[model samples]
Target: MRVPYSYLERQFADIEPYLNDLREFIKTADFTLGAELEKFEKRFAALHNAPHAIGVGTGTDALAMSFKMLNIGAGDEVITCANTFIASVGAIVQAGATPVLVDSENGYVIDPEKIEAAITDKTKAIMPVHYTGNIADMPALAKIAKKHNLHIVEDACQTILGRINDKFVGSWGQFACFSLHPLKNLNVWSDAGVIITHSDEYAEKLRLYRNHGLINRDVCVEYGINCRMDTIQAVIANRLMNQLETITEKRRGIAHLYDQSFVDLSEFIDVPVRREGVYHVFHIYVLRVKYRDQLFQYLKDNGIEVKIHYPIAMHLQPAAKSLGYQQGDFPMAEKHGEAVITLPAHPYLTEEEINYIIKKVREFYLEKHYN
Candidate 1:
């Protein structure tokens, strides 16, 4: 009856397959930028139909590297959603640029409508985060970025298989960064990331940038940090890539069930609208409901594992105080912080578990009699 949030234990219960791959990999000692890494990069790029996939140390590194390669630093500004994970903003700051936060629409993505007003002369890029596995409004954002001649570095860390209008998340931006953190949809055993791009020039430069700017053993073109993706992690990623389609379909099916079950409780719960032809992978199934705190506690007491994606919006965080943002700056993001609750809808959950979660949610609303 106890629903679990993390499925890693269950997912990797049979460790022999992964260990077997590692055993053979250890014999080669091809640790840095070798065959396994190359294979992973190729498969990852093919997933999005992109020409290149540059592996980096982490998702934050992926975004930071993109900013660096685009020459966006010091005095430059990157516009992003106020509701995004802190890493998105951290990556901007890591590149010596300022992050300009914009309010999110109901879809938990930066409101393209508000983006125009936030742009100024210093704005150099639009870093749209595909939060909670939902793709952002890329078409509108693409138009805006094109009009202003700004680069688009998509923070696609949480959205691996997501797409809108048949084009994947990585296709709309200059660079799309994905995280292979253990919790992500497409994950590895440790921290890892990949950046996909179509530009040949950027691709060639990025390979050097990730390897201390070394063209070879004797030459160093530019001073760049060591942010190489571990070969061992790439081995894990290569194995996991084979299961990406199954994982995505399972997560999508779970979200669909939750949506169907929760529709009857619309009086107290607000299920965010799903745009047409947008394939949401549902990394985190979130709901905005009345009496959120009480329901959160009620679900916990009933042995249902739930979470809040975040209790605070990015612009209102203490770390962002220097950015000169106030509480009322992003009304929609603030509302999200107050009302959102994450449900246990990962692929590992059984039908019984899913129905139990749905039943408990209905019980809570009916028992409280909220109108």
Candidate 2:
């Protein structure tokens, strides 16, 4: 069985009826910030239990907008974790703020325990990434932010309904960013994104800012740039919004199966602990293995497709040169980079395919170590 990672073919088939709405939406020609977009923005905010949400062009744009709301600029610093996609740091660069790197705890989420030591007078905000659909220690991060008078901008792009202690990840931050790319749990056809916020004041600013800060065709509130989500993407996203609960459950179920299979093989494979009350949506299931690179190649040779979330830690990347970070700067993140391999946990993956993937992984380890 070929357990390929891309599930778009199956996912689109499931969302066929939602895509049928495209004809109904196309006739309107309201492509530029139309009714469909508002419907999606409202439903999205309600779905995530946030006060307001604004649709944007991409996840990077979403984070940049949040940074703009917080007035982060050249001299400001935003504390974020390493071992994440470059987008988090890209957003900091987009906002002209320096991204102060912090080592990850489990090589996943930024360690709240290590965050405070990186803070200085220039630290304007803390951007906690709910990486791989796992919610970071929000309760502790919130307390840290409050004590230091710093703002929060969460990169919740990978998670759908992630929670910590019953509160959602998006609700904890001043501006929470989410992605609707085709691969995301709740996705659109292309690169669309949203920013969730609790303040109506910030929401108003975002509305204007996403559309060149326009009050009317001729009136302008302030100088801003265009980053609006297309109506077509909104139509698909809104139509599928109601299915989020089912999607989350499907992915979680598959993730649990994978976790269960590795329970007896703790030495070769390690699964991160699921924190109490953290409703992980399983956007990606990453496993840390002893011989991760060899296993990654062996799985590929055996027709079991998988991925590496990031082979390089942010502090060690070439793009981070001016930031003055080295390989040993964030040890936890670096170690994670060398050991982690992402598995297929998409909702459409079959039980048989999952078993094949698990079987192949163990087969490779057993042959390499125990044979």
Candidate 3:
């Protein structure tokens, strides 16, 4: 039997009670922003250890709203890593700001030391993407931001509960963005996103911006877009939030299994490393291999599901060519872009499936070396 990459059915089973709550909510015909959404916003804020959280339509919107909240508009440049999904870059463009791309380290997170060199007088913010749940060097980045007086927007899209040096990833930055896409560790069966921040001014502006710049019915405060998260999605997110701790534990357990199983092959394959006291919620169990394309194909041919998290760095994309970045600009991010492959680390894998995956991978490497 083919090993599925994720186990949504089991997850749904666990969230059945929340689904039931949604059913009751539907019966009341209160579908817009209501009690469930309010409760979710509060719970999500507390979970991330942030003072405020606001739900939006999608991850892209979350980032866009963050830029607007910080007043990063025309002529402003936002520094972010190129080794992440396009949504991060897209948000910068959508917010009418210029995206200054930076290269990530070998582990797919932004290198703090490299950030200072990229800053200019026009630079207004630093958007550090926590790629593949690996927390960026926030302390160093924070210092750079403080020295330059730039805002830090944490792109926690891939890392919901990622931590660095005992400090939560989302709590350090001026604002944090998270995605609840169906494939993410936490999803709402529909597009959902959130922004967390401590500034009441930012929170108040975000609330108005999400609902078309309206302070109340028929009142427009500032130019905004329709980016509110419907009540149903909020309810689903709330249900998932109730079990986030347990789900995170399960994901961590799977990551440890992969780490233990691949210890002997460390020289050939690069497994992710968790820093001291940092909780890495393994959203995607990524590994760096010499022949990533061949290994990906081999796993697929053997009925083992595997895929690349990002095959192309954002700076190289056609839309970003105007940034004037040539090939080989960021060697580390470029290498990672080509060599990283992600295996399933969702909470639904059975023991047999996990073992099968481990055994097949070992056999593939053995044959390559011996034969």
Worst 10 residues of 2 by lDDT: 362-371
lDDT tens digits by residue: candidate 2, 70-183: 899889999999868999999999999999988887628899999999999999999999998888889899999999999999999897777776587777788899999978
Candidate 3, which segments miss by more than 4 Å at Cα?
13-19, 369-371
* Candidate with maximal TM-score: 1
lDDT of 3 by residue, 228-311 (tens): 888888878877777788888898998899889988987668986666676777778888986788878888888988988778
Give the TM-scores of the predictions, in the order they appear. Answer: 0.98, 0.97, 0.95
Deviation (Å) of 23 in candidate 3: 2.5
Q: After superposition, how far is residue 292 of candidate 3 from its true place, in Å?
A: 1.6
Candidate 1 TM-score, true structure as reference: 0.98
Which candidate has the top score in lDDT? 1
Q: Higher-lDDT candidate among 1 and 3?
A: 1
Q: Residues 253-274, candidate 1: write the lDDT tens digits.
A: 9999889998988988999999
Residue 154, model 1: Cα distance from true site in angstroms: 0.6
Q: List the pairs of residues colliding in candidate 3.
A: none
C-alpha lDDT score of every prediction, in listed order? 0.92, 0.87, 0.84
Order the numbered candidates by lDDT, best leading: 1, 2, 3
Residue 80's lDDT within candidate 2 is: 97
Q: Give per-residue lDDT, candidate 3, residue 174.
A: 75
